[PDB]
Amino acid sequence: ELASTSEFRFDPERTPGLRHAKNLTDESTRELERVLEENHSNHHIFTTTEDHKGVYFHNHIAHHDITIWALGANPSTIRSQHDRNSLYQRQAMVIQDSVVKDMADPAVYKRCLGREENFLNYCRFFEDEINRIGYQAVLQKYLVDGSEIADDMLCRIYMGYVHGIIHIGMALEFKQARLLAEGFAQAAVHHDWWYTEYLTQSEELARKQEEPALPLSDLIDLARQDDAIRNCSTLYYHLQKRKVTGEMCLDLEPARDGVLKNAGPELRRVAARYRVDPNDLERATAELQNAAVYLTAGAQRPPHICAFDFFLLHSVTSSIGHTMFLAEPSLSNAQKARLLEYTGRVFLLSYAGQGSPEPRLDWLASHPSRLPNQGWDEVFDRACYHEDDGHMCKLIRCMAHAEETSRPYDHLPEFRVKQGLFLTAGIAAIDSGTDKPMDGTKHFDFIRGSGFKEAWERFPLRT
Ligand SMILES: [Fe+3]
Predict the structure, then answer these.
(1) Per-residue b or e along 315-328, where b marks 16 or more CB atoms closer than 10 Å to that residue's CB
(2) How far apart are CA 305 and CA 312, in angstroms?
(3) What is the 3-state secondary structure (H, E, C) of 50-98?
(4) β-pairing, 442-443 with 438-439?
(5) Spatial separation of the C-alpha atoms in residues 231 and 166, rounded to whole Å
(6) How far apart are CA 359 and CA 299, in angstroms?
(7) How far apart are CA 306 and CA 173, in angstroms?
(8) What's the rounded Cα separation, in Å, for the pair 459 and 461?
(9) 321 alpha carbon to ligand 1 midpoint, in Å?
(10) How far is ligand 1, taken at its centre, from the CA of residue 314, in Å?
(11) By residue range, what is the domain housing residue 393?
(12) Distance (Å) from CA 58 to ligand 1 centroid
């Protein structure tokens, strides 16, 4: 069903995605296919070595290029945005074809995991697997069939702030086998072991069904009520510097060193209550999308302008992929539920890491629009020109998708974000944007640590 493993092929009618601008052009589509293949062949999946900043920074070019194509970017804009973000990339790894073939021995496949030098080797392995058994059997063998290999990969798609699942979501949404292999390959080369421990232990505990299942929105609220969870982190994770040079680093990591060290049992107890009903997946999927907008767009602080949290917004951008998992006939209801469970448990981990900010939808709702007469089409067009690495446009496109998936459920209490507030959130997001949102890989327009009062000091007061 997907475009070939061996090339990117988009179409404004056949592959426009779940949410997009009105009148997508062939000219823009051809430019997008050119820049994606340049990215695949020339750039690595990580923009930094792990020791530079302490954790890997990720290559967002595939995400950014596709997103601004979907939001109606012209070919000049696609090229400009791609060229600027190319400048800080690492050089692609070498393909060794004998390793690509040897990876069919599960012992070899396992030996290569978590090693970034294998990224293109795994891309080629997953292309070969998709061609051998088809993409649907690949989702079973490498993600949901419950084998040791699929269970291992299911944790890895969340590693590195969920970029594996963002990539996989986008590969399915835009119907690209070449991008699906990239996404499995991205996940295979991560080695953030605490995701494996957290998600495996949370799933084991959930089997006991000790306390009633709750919608994600209610579990976001339960996390804040917990003394250990609400105090488990610190703004210091965003202020730590290297002793010699004073350079920013994440040598301490909020989840590994804060949340799971200080409030492991308490968070696992909350996580264990996010059990999804396999007979109610359209609503449960919409509910997870709404809960991501709730915890992210809600993370506001009077009297400051509306700002979006860089770590929390990965909840919104990852959440879209569950619309594709839902639409996939080859996945069982039980498999689709288990995917939502993992994702929502990671949203709780991420949320606790940023100080569990108390939602202020009242403050978000009163956001004054910088510009008059802004609807989604206006916001989409502005997002095309925003000069970051894609996070602003992905946030805006995935909030617009959530508004649509929430519309059937607007009257239900577990859906905290009601219909008018999604466009308000979108305006708030683009209005927070500046003329110089980045410097190389450094972001300036997003708050880090929204749940700590001191994070807000550099944000202006709403006039
Ligand atoms: Fe990201």
Answers:
(1) bbbbbbbbbbbbeb
(2) 17
(3) HHHHCCCCECCHHHHHHHHHHCCCCHHHHHHHHHHHHCCCCECCCCCHH
(4) antiparallel
(5) 29
(6) 5
(7) 30
(8) 7
(9) 15
(10) 6
(11) 196-458
(12) 7
Distance 163 CA to ligand 1 centre (A): 6
Does residue 268 share a domain with residue 250? yes
Cβ neighbours of residue 91 closer than 8 Å, sequence gap 6 or more: 42, 43, 44
Elucidated via: X-ray
Resolution in A: 1.7
What the block records as the tokens of 62 is 């595939």
Gap from CA of 367 to ligand 1 centroid (Å): 25
Residue 10 lies in a domain: no
Any idea what DSSP says for residue 373? S
Identity of the amino acid at 91 = Q
d(C-alpha 445, C-alpha 308), whole Å: 8
Ligand 1 geometric centre to CA of 346 (Å) = 15
Token output for 446: 């997003």
- Kindly state whether residue 8 falls inside one of the protein's structural domains: no
C-alpha 57 – ligand 1 centre gap (Å): 8
> Ligand 1 mean position to 101 CA, how many Å?
31
In angstroms, the CA 353 to CA 54 distance is: 17
Gap from CA of 319 to ligand 1 centroid (Å): 13
- Cα 107 to ligand 1 centroid, rounded to whole Å: 31
Q: What is the dihedral of CA 402, 404, 406, 407, to 10 degrees?
A: 160
Ligand 1 center–CA 152 separation, angstroms: 22
SS3 call for 405: helix
Residue 283 covered by a domain: yes
> In the listed set 132, 165, 191, which residue is the last one of a domain according to the structure?
191
